[PDB]
Amino acid sequence: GVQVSPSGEKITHTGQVYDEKDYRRVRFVDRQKEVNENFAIDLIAQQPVNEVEHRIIACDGGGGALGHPKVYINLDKETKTGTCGYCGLQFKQH
Amino acid sequence: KRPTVRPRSDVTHKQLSAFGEYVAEILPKYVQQVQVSCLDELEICIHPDGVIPTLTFLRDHTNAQFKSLADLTAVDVPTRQNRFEIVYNLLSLRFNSRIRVKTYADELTPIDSIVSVHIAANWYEREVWDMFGVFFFNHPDLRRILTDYGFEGHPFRKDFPLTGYVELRYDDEVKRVVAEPVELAQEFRKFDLNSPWEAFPAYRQPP
Amino acid sequence: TSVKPIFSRDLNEAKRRVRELYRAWYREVPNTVHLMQLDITVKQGRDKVREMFMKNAHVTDPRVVDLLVIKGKMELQETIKVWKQRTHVMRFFHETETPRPKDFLSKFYMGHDP
Amino acid sequence: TYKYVNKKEQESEVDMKSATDNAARILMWTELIRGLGMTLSYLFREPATINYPFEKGPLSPRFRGEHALRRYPSGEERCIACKLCEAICPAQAITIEAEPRADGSRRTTRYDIDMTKCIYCGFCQEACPVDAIVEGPNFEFSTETHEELLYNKEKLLNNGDKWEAEIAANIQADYLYR
Amino acid sequence: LHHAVIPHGKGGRSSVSGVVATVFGATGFLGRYVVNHLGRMGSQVIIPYRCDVYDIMHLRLMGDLGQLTFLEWDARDKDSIRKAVQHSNVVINLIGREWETRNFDFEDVFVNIPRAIAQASKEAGVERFIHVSHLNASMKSSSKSLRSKAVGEKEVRSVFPEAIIIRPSDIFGREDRFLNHFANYRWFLAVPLVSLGFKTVKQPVYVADVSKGIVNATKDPDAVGKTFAFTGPNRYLLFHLVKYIFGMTHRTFIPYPLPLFVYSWIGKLFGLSPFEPWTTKDKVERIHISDVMPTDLPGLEDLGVQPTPLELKSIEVLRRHRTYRWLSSEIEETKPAKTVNY
Amino acid sequence: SRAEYVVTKLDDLINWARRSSLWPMTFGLACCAVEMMHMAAPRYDMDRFGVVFRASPRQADVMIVAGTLTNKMAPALRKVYDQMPEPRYVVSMGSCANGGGYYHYSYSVVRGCDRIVPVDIYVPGCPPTAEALLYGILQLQRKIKREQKLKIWYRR
Amino acid sequence: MELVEVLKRGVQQVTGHGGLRGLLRVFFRANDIRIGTLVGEDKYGNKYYEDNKQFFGRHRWVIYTTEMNGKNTFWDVDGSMVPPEWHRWLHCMTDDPPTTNPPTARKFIWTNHKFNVSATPEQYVPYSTTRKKIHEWVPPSTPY
Ligand SMILES: NC(=O)C1=CN([C@@H]2O[C@H](COP(=O)(O)OP(=O)(O)OC[C@H]3O[C@@H](n4cnc5c(N)ncnc54)[C@H](OP(=O)(O)O)[C@@H]3O)[C@@H](O)[C@H]2O)C=CC1
Ligand code: SF4
């Protein structure tokens, strides 16, 4: 999910790139600007939205102590889908 | 019962408290505000002019054989007009007790040396001067011990910036190590961590 | 008012010490330049000694002057012996730092300094 | 209880045999030929040396080395810009400038660590409440220029798309102690 | 004016001065000092180099984190110049050698390369381009080096108008080839000279004064189409100059006459060495060429640098030529040379 | 055959002798030098790579700047670095020597030996493991393995 | 006697690598004629061996590849070539090689290990990751 700017430079997942006229591009001459190609916006969206039975569902990373602090989501909204604040997972009911 | 709270051996509080008074009325000309802390350690505050008589007494006296000078520190407190509060930690090896002796000073109020009494002071005695600018009388050598040969400063004073005023680098124009004013690449990040709540009500200061 | 003295009854007495310390430096510049191979000549070395004194010629507290003299003697002891090398002695001459300007317009052009 | 180390017990007891024992000792270097004997034994022992490139010395799962920003199994970054790994870092090596990610999540826009300032103390991995930053076993990342030790979020995620096969096993084998 | 280029700080390391510069002679003798004065302040100096990465090692000082970027290039091969002068604002061309090699003539080091740097900079879009020639760069000259630089100076300007042509005199410094040359004549029992050195006048200039001039040439709004001549003061007479070198270097002084035709052929012999030759036919003529007067050019004073006299900064370079029993002598015992306005 | 080919082999010969006889200097400042001894200890013997410690800078090829470099010591380190006959290399070891490390913000620490001597390889850590320094020494040996100093001489 | 036994073991090591050419490729390249059980191999070519008889530290070793990413590493062998799944085992952090206990697979873990790069191209070069903080003013493109 990496897109190249018009100057040929690679845009990172934070949206940064150096303009064609910026002198700081010199550091990449004869070298490369490493960018991580596994974006976070795209990968989290490709997950399926889980469906649960209760109106309040817990979320942790999955392993318990290896995850993130125990949080509780409210799933009364129907127009939107409740999102865990730490990990970007989503939950619905029905 | 209470595995967290430290055991309190109150016996050694009485012994120290008795000795502090004994020193108080056997050397009244200088002794000020003797005190004993929770942690059972005695603390005697001495007028600066009485450093030699108090330190000489506490070493030679039969009932107070404080022959080992543990260290000679200095606390900078800009709040009080007499900033530098010189501290002497002493040890006995006979009565197995530690006693602290404190005096005050100032950047224009030197203090009499102690190398005559405790030779251990000699190097500690310069360390204070090199770090705090507290001149000491009657010292033999008295030169900087820690800082570079060209610091026009006194690093441990609270008015001295942590990064200092000068940095060293190598220059080819002059082919020697040169000194230039400090320009940090990433400024030291002062974290305002103080909480706004009374952690300890036992130390409240009314207005 | 009512401040204890330190090696000085009055300013005039402490001025003698400063004049004693100056005679110790003026007699010493020609020995450091040779003992440690400095690139300066003795004539301009003595100028810097004098300059470092006029930097502190506006002081009038007897106690301060004595401390200045005490530090100067320590500065002299580290130079009488070669404890401080060519790197330290040539640090006073400031042969690398750009001469900071004084004109307000020059300051206005470069930097936000007052 | 003390113990005398160089104090003679009882003296003034020497006969011809005892006198000649000392003469033989001094006059034929007995206690110097005794020292040679120990070194000669050591020659006939297996050296402790190990071919470093080919066999590498032992380590432990808790080892603290190169840093790494982890991710959840789904792919989402663990770091949530809580910024208490730069609060405890006693070298001010970490810097964070997080802003909202435009999908609503709290994520970082800068996570640069200066490995020349870092002291590999491990406080940042025990402060993080999501295990976002860890310290893998990679102790061998020496460089030929100062600049490559100034890690940024892109490097720290690369170290973390690389050592997860190792980092996960290490955390999985010591998190109970933590 | 990109926001990055804008100057910042009090001036020094870890600062920004907006002087992104490509120095094409950094590995040399003058290049060391030019980079230093660029790196001492806040400047990102791009240093093209062809030498060993070891010979450029000493240049990794005098610049904060990432204020230096080292790139490889070959003078014959085009498209390595453009890759280096692309993002720069000022290009400082110091390329120059005092002898022919197997691959490079003087035409290929003083005329061709500056054209390639100049053409590759004008197209790239640099603002300034500072070029160095010699003061005696007249077309009607005797030295092969000086004449070639005369053409290169004209050819650089034609391709890249509004260039700054710097014309230093013989530059003296620590690792120079002027005071370190005459001082090295001791290895022969005497110091050959043409006409005992009379009828020849030198006006040496200190490197730091030159490098200060070059560094301030990429700041001052004027001096964008001017030609300078960094000569320095005190036009000595070559006999008096060399006699003074041996005055500081307490060795000897036995000058004797020598025709320039023999003293060139002997010099031509030393030019056959595969390594850096000690002398060459071209260096004989440069040492024996009177330096023109600076009257019709701005000079150092018109740019903000104070010329430094030779007597002040001569012991720094000539100390290593002294021997024990004379290593500790000072500037006082030298009876300095006599200036001549001839 | 081409004369260039012979040059490179001589270049590789001079480099090889400089790779397998890399003599450092017994110049451990503090607190990394303990792990510079372990590198010399039985487990990670440096005599394997023909690496022998010598006190005199005149007989030392590489300088392992291990430990915090302070202002008082800065003039001494540069002097010692100057004495080493060329070619010479510097191997900054540890955080205190690479940058300022734990004392980056102190008043009497030069923020990294790179400000005083030109460093060839940086070995991160605090202290670097004895292997980490050994990887640095080997990675320095591979630096000499590609010098190209005689190859460029033919091109000059 | 026992001398024949050890001289017999030496024959096993000198003649236990396929042939003479096999011995040469390891003697001058690893300085280690030992032979032990072949635990496994990487996709890059690294061969991992173990010999439980020998002492701790010398009971697990690698014989690296001759080529990893078009590098020609027959001689220039460096420690930063053991992939993560084996770096754990080779360093005596576990008893289970990844052949019997494979690492958990994820859709973002690197497939092709990259050795340490310090002077070769494809090098790390640090940069800031935040965007612009202050936006300047663009003037109108037509007079007044
Ligand atoms: N007395 C003096 O020193 C005078 C100097 N100048 C000018 O000063 C400039 C430099 O002076 P100085 O530095 O003392 O001379 P140097 O020979 O010391 O500088 C040489 C520089 O030019 C580079 N260079 C030379 N030939 C080539 C080439 N064919 N291809 C690529 N790069 C090349 C060298 O690279 P490498 O290091 O790889 O050779 C080195 O960087 C020159 O332009 C000279 O004309 C002017 C008047 C007199
Ligand atoms: S290991 Fe310690 S010093 Fe290094 S970044 Fe983490 S908290 Fe800071």
Ligand code: SF4
């Ligand atoms: S790495 Fe962990 S502790 Fe640091 S900012 Fe991210 S979530 Fe917080």
Ligand code: SF4
């Ligand atoms: S980097 Fe760490 S181990 Fe090395 S000297 Fe500094 S504090 Fe000690």
Ligand SMILES: [Zn+2]
């Ligand atoms: Zn969650």
